Amino acid sequence: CRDRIPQNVCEQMKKNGKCGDPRMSTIAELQCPKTCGKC
Numbered sequence: 422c423r424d425r426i427p428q429n430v431c432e433q434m435k436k437n438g439k440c441g442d443p444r445m446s447t448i449a450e451l452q453c454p455k456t457c458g459k460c
Contacts, residue, residue: 422460424453431456 424431431453439445440457454460 422454424455426452428456 434440434445434449434453435456440449440453440459442449449457450459
């Protein structure tokens with residue numbers, strides 16, 4: 422399972438720590454399912 426978007430954009434998402442936060446649970450998944458590791 423890969424991410425529709427590149428790692429360039431998913432990077433900031435990882436450093437931000439939103440992938441784990443509840444506010445960014447669905448968005449972080451659909452946007453970065455691989456980078457966040459939730460697929």
